């Protein structure tokens with residue numbers, strides 16, 4: 001019947017309760033979350049480039065380094081435009097399909113969101 005939750009960092013009265021996914025203090029009329037008040041970057045497994053930017057499933061990318069292709073005759077050059085990518089589960093994973101050779105996987109650390 002009693003809350004095992006922390007007090008209120010504003011009242012310390014301890015008359016705090018849990019209303020769903022956080023703690024609400026009915027005293028000072030302010031809800032707060034113990035750890036989430038600090039907040040962190042979650043949903044961050046989205047594929048990020050060496051530019052420090054985040055891509056979108058369908059966005060246009062461009063390798064910013066000289067990358068070879070092992071099974072294909074193609075060599076990936078700084079400016080290799082591959083659009084409409086697929087964001088895979090791992091942040092180190094850009095799935096892309098390339099007219100001609102086929103589908104390929106790209107190292108996030110070697111690619112970049114074009115900006116278009």
Ligand SMILES: [Zn+2]
Pocket residue numbers: 008009010011012025027028029030
């Ligand atoms: Zn309070």
